[PDB]
Design a binder for this molecule. Structure first.
Ligand SMILES: CCCCCCCC(=O)OC[C@H](COP(=O)(O)O[C@@H]1[C@H](O)[C@H](OP(=O)(O)O)[C@@H](O)[C@H](OP(=O)(O)O)[C@H]1O)OC(=O)CCCCCCC
Ligand SMILES: CCCCCCCC(=O)OC[C@H](COP(=O)(O)O[C@@H]1[C@H](O)[C@H](OP(=O)(O)O)[C@@H](O)[C@H](OP(=O)(O)O)[C@H]1O)OC(=O)CCCCCCC
Ligand SMILES: *[C@@H]1O[C@H](CO)[C@@H](O[C@@H]2O[C@H](CO)[C@@H](O)[C@H](O)[C@H]2NC(C)=O)[C@H](O)[C@H]1NC(C)=O
Ligand SMILES: *[C@@H]1O[C@H](CO)[C@@H](O[C@@H]2O[C@H](CO)[C@@H](O)[C@H](O)[C@H]2NC(C)=O)[C@H](O)[C@H]1NC(C)=O
Ligand SMILES: *[C@@H]1O[C@H](CO)[C@@H](O)[C@H](O)[C@H]1NC(C)=O
Ligand SMILES: *[C@@H]1O[C@H](CO)[C@@H](O)[C@H](O)[C@H]1NC(C)=O
Lengths: 723, 723
């Protein structure tokens, strides 16, 4: 009962190194062991995520409501109380695992408890008083989704944005200084003209030069001055040159470069925190004998507690992939690579087909015939020729019918001809190659998806479900097969499906900024923007709704900007998307400040600066990884190839018979005894594979400075171990 | 007469290495020597620049004319003929220096000759027919300003933009594909509504989605669809996410990264071309004796032909700065650094003041008193306190008079008080420190400039020149002294005045693109945009001019976009500046295509793509140098310090007395004999200094990969010298 506890403890060191969890709270007794095992399941993590996500989606039914998803007050009050009681349960369990003095000194959980208390109080107050009072405190509910376990990549990306901020504030102050001094000069220089609303007072000049900084009103702010004297253009050319190009691009460059340094040091601390965890494990399950290493028995002991649900054959394969020195041990120089070998799935190599050992003759020659045709290199060039003729046919047919062919109910017979060609090619390729060897490649999956989508649209249209005619409209997506002919598109699309979870983990951070601004925007600008209001401002042309009664036609004209409300969480989300895309944001701004005070100008200006810093950091960081991996693809997942013999299995099998483990492991090794006998051979070659994570790109980016990190790390450990 | 020709030839090798000129055309005979000396003066270079710049400014008087600078047809025809005859003179002289077979095989001069012939022909045709016909061929006159000698940094920056182009065209084709396929889907999906002009035909959908790619009409193109069904926002969110953010930022990232690689290889070829020039010079004027090096006599021979107008004292100082091994020779390892030592100016070190050896007592104690006060560290903190009180006074005074104080004729007496403080501080600092030691620093130059500017505005206002009141309006530029208190602003402003010629050399390339587009735009869209036209389009609201006659006021309302003409070269320059700043470009586009055909849509789309690639490359390249030199300034011109003794001057003086050179050199060395005797010392310490060029930043950027370049270069030379 000793070595199994060493195995459990060493697997805890590896999980605790993976999840970036501090080594002071490593469990020693059985009480802290059971608490650690109670918290770190996948049930508890999914309970955190479902509770937090239900709370954010509970904001969809509260007091500014989508009118069909509206509940009464006591219903969503008690749902809010129930979800907060689940959060109390989770903080009690983490308080059970960690100590009290470790719990209090961790700042994120303490802020989470204070937000928990305030949300609990106003939930009870809304439950008693029967009416929702203000509810601005909802905007702090992003901390329940950030502080979970699956959203670590969101939490770190927010923290590094707020840590990139002190170089931003300095040059921002340099920006606002020149903006004010050109507002003073502009007020003196252009206010005597009675024919402009722009430079009339001081706040009109300061607001209009802040909007001109975003270039949202550039010709319109210059024209009443440019009509009087044509030398008034010098003011705006000098202003845009100094302020926009030089200073604002200097601002974004400085913020992004401190963001890269902060990420580089965060990745450094993550590698070094993994490395000490491996060193504690090797300290725990070494031999302490005349050889210094790890035997196969202890490595079996790691893999039966770290990464369970794993075959004994796969376990032996990972051991031989870690050996690398051909002695029956593991040194630290070869045990420093657990995380990148224990994460790969092992497959055998079989050269037979999946339709030949089952059927007899005279269809055996058929499936041989289809395999020869589908792997002939003339069938491929023929199919590219079919795609090219299809595209030229579509283009000439749009020049014939003047683009009017995309409105009729009548399916062209040419569409039926090409759909039969891609269909027959789909059956011949999926049968002559095998459906396992068909869904392997991504392009075959794309062609199957598009062609089966077009059969669905064709069948639904002959079923007279006319809203499914847009599938018939999307014909030229079949021309997207033609892009694998060029090399650079293969690089772009492979990198696009490699960097996809990282892009989702950054879009979620941008959605957190939208969520807090949308809740403040709902509770203060709820019922202001109506049709045909704001007629005392300069934006009366845009909030208008005029009927006419010529004939019996009741033709209406309207300016449509009364639809950018803050009535719901959904109308406010599409409004904040219209403010991220920078154009015409001053119209929504000055409509709201026509109805409310001027401090709502302060709202929209703050949202502009926040969304611009966040958007440049997200786009630049993703595209730096994107360009690096394309150029690396022109410098040259990963595939390892190892093998075993039957002589290397005689040592393995009697150990499982002697130690008396489970039964499925033993019978698995009996099955590979049979598979060695059927082919009449001893040495059998296996094949390992795993998909690229973001840490592999981060190792290839910073490759020239990693050994320096490990040397400085070992020196720091010698400072602690000499003391 | 032998060694002087070796000196002349070696100085030609160093000039030919500096100017990036090929070594096949090195002159051998006296004929090619006199031709090389006739071409490479500073008179010939300034003749090239003045001819080309007069030709581009001759386009200001031609047939679309600024109406006050308008000439007749024969006057500017003969000016065009005279300037082209000067260009014929220059090509005849370069044909005199280079061979014929070298002249023909150089592509830039051959294109320059063909443009010379065509411009010569249509100049004669305009001179005969008395009316200007079309004159689109003017747009190729940028090649006369690019192909000169002072505009090498413009020529290289244009060439690398056109060499960055094949990765651009590929992803641009990927952009236009998804734009068309969403135009087909959008035409099907939103055309049945009678209340929108956007998706009505096919060309309206393709044009409006190309404009939506620039985000110039984003809310307005969505709103008539978003009013019908609110789920129509999914189309535009998916379109902007895939097309704008991902693909367009991928486009700009790929173009900028190939631009950096092209610049890296161009800088590599420039260093290696300098290095072979130094190797030819060391081959030419070595000893060929028992020591292998360069004596002082031959190094005097270089400096009397390379870098003339140089003292013999400065010549000896550069030799001792090149020695670095304390033997009377120069090896190649210390002669590889000519260009960075021969470019620095040498000064002595003197600790006396400039107002003490002239005046007697009782004012000697006065100027001592002002020096002690101006260097006291309490006078400085006092002056910062004066600036801070001045700024708080300005802010509170704008809150008092509601910003209305910037309109009155009355000068505030507070302005007179602070102006007397800065004036007295200016005289006390410029007298207590010395005007040579006052104009050294940049901030003192700034404070002198601002304060003397304010005396000029005050004196002109008491002279009742009321248009000089804007100097009184620009009070808060005196608050810009307060920014040297923080470290990061000192870094930003020092880097801004270091990277300034490079920024001018990139703005000139952007002006060449404006020039060619402005000439095509003048000759095809001359008299189209009038007041109150284009009333059949959707932009009738913007080209309008309506009078009213209420009372006797004749108040007018107008839409002002008829002022963005193409009538002149100046109206077209401010119009193209309004198209670089992206906002509201489709209004100018659809006004022009209301008057002309649809191929002018093809004009404005091409100009958008060109100006976007050029603007991102310019901004990103400058800001990469900017951030690198700020972070390098937190890692740690250049200053060298060498000395000589009188014993080291006894060797120098008798060589100039024996060889019998000039007289001013000998008398200069007699003057430093006197300056050594007056202080009663032998060793005297001198001080060298030069300002940072762009090649020093380029050496510090690529520092980790330069020795690899020199090794590969030496291997290439051994491949040629073994054969
Ligand atoms: C406006 C907020 C600006 C925040 C900008 C400052 C952000 C900031 O530096 O974190 C410092 C701490 C939070 O820091 P905190 O997150 O509590 O603690 C860190 C995490 O534990 C991190 O784990 P993961 O990141 O999950 O992997 C760990 O690696 C770090 O250890 P290390 O140092 O050895 O690397 C810890 O220092 O304190 C707060 O920030 C409280 C936040 C309360 C929020 C209040 C308002 C909602
Ligand atoms: C639309 C034009 C696109 C141009 C994009 C291609 C530009 C391009 O690659 O240069 C190739 C040559 C010009 O090349 P060209 O300039 O004539 O010749 C180069 C220069 O002499 C350069 O000196 P500097 O640049 O002054 O320092 C030198 O270093 C290079 O030698 P190296 O290789 O050993 O380094 C030469 O190859 O040919 C043309 O380009 C003719 C241009 C006529 C313009 C016609 C229309 C106005
Ligand atoms: C601008 O809109 C306001 C609505 O807030 C208009 O005020 C109303 O005018 C009508 C008749 O003109 C009156 O019957 C209402 O009582 C007014 N409402 C209020 C709250 O006073 C105003 O007339 C409009 N101004 C225009 C069109 O110039
Ligand atoms: C649109 O503009 C055209 C100008 O091209 C106007 O046509 C002119 O109309 C006036 C009187 O309506 C006639 O005297 C002119 O002879 C017309 N010009 C031409 C060239 O025929 C037209 O009226 C305008 N339409 C509007 C304002 O609805
Ligand atoms: C316009 O007419 C509709 C009915 O056709 C009516 O409901 C609406 O209130 C009218 N809008 C006005 C008068 O502003
Ligand atoms: C408007 O009135 C001015 C005179 O004040 C006149 O010159 C101009 O032509 C008028 N514009 C019209 C009638 O469109």
């Amino acid at each position: 009962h000793n070595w199994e506890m060493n195995y459990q403890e060493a697997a805890i060191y590896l999980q605790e190194g993976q999840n970036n969890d501090k080594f002071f709270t490593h469990p020693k007794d059985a009480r802290a062991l059971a608490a650690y095992l109670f918290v770190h399941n996948h049930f508890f993590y999914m309970m955190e995520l479902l509770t937090a996500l239900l709370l954010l989606l509970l904001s969809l039914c509260e007091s500014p409501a989508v009118p069909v998803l509206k509940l009464h007050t006591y219903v969503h009050a008690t749902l809010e109380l129930f979800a907060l009681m689940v959060v109390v349960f989770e903080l009690c369990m983490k308080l059970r695992w960690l100590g009290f003095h470790t719990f209090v000194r961790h700042k994120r959980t303490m802020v989470k408890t204070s937000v928990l208390v305030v949300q609990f109080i106003e939930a009870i107050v809304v439950l008693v008083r029967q009416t929702s009072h203000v509810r601005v405190t909802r905007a702090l509910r992003c901390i329940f989704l950030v502080d979970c376990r699956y959203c670590g990549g969101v939490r770190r990306n927010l923290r590094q944005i707020f840590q990139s901020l002190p170089p931003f504030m300095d040059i921002l102050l340099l920006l606002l200084f020149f903006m004010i001094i050109f507002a003073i000069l502009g007020f003196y220089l252009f206010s005597t003209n009675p024919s402009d609303p722009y430079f009339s007072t001081l706040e009109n000049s300061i607001v209009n030069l802040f909007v001109l900084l975003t270039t949202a009103n550039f010709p319109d702010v210059m024209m009443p001055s440019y009509s009087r004297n044509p030398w008034s253009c010098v003011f705006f050319i000098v202003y845009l040159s100094i302020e926009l190009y030089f200073i604002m691009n200097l601002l974004l460059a400085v913020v992004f470069d401190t963001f890269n340094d902060i990420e580089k040091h965060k990745f450094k601390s993550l590698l070094l925190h993994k490395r000490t965890a491996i060193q504690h494990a090797y300290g725990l399950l070494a031999s302490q004998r005349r050889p210094a290493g790890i035997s196969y028995r202890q490595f079996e002991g790691l893999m039966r507690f770290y990464k369970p649900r794993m075959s004994a054959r796969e376990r032996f394969l990972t051991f031989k992939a870690l050996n690398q020195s051909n002695t029956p041990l593991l040194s630290l120089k070869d045990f420093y690579d657990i995380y990148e070998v224990a994460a790969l799935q092992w497959k055998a190599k079989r050269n037979r087909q999946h339709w030949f050992d089952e059927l007899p003759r005279t269809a055996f020659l058929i499936f041989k015939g289809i395999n020869i045709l589908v792997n002939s290199k003339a069938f491929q060039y023929f199919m590219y020729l079919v795609v090219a003729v299809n595209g030229v046919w579509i283009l000439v047919e749009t020049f014939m019918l003047k683009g009017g062919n995309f409105t009729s109910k009548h399916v062209p017979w040419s569409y039926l001809v090409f759909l039969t060609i891609y269909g027959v090619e789909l059956f011949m390729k999926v049968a002559g190659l095998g459906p396992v060897e068909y869904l392997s490649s991504g392009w075959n999956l794309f062609d199957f998806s598009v062609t089966a989508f077009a059969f669905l649209g064709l069948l639904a249209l002959t079923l007279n479900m006319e809203p499914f005619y847009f599938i018939v409209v999307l014909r030229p997506l079949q021309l997207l097969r033609l892009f694998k002919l060029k090399k650079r598109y293969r690089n772009v699309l492979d990198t696009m499906f490699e960097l996809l979870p990282r892009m989702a983990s950054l879009g979620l951070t941008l959605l957190t900024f939208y969520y807090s601004f949308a809740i403040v925007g709902m509770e203060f600008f709820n019922g202001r923007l109506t049709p045909n209001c704001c007629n005392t401002s300069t934006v009366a042309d845009a909030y208008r709704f005029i009927n006419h009664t010529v004939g019996n036609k009741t033709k209406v004209e309207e300016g449509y900007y009364y639809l950018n409300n803050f009535d719901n969480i959904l109308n406010s989300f599409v409004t904040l998307f219209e403010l991220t895309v920078v154009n015409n944001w001053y119209i929504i701004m000055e409509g709201v400040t026509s109805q409310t005070s001027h401090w709502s100008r302060l709202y929209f200006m703050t949202f502009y600066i926040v969304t611009m810093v966040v958007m440049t950091i997200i786009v630049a960081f993703i595209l730096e990884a994107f360009v690096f991996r394309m150029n690396y693809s022109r410098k040259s997942g990963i595939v390892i190839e190892k093998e075993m013999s039957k002589e290397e299995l005689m040592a393995v099998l009697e150990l499982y018979r002697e130690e008396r483990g489970t039964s499925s492991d033993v019978t698995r090794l009996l099955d590979t005894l049979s598979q060695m006998e059927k082919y009449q051979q001893n040495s059998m070659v296996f094949l390992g594979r795993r998909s690229r994570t973001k840490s592999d790109l981060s190792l290839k980016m910073y490759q020239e400075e990693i050994q320096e990190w490990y040397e400085e790390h070992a020196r720091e450990q010698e400072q602690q171990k000499l003391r």
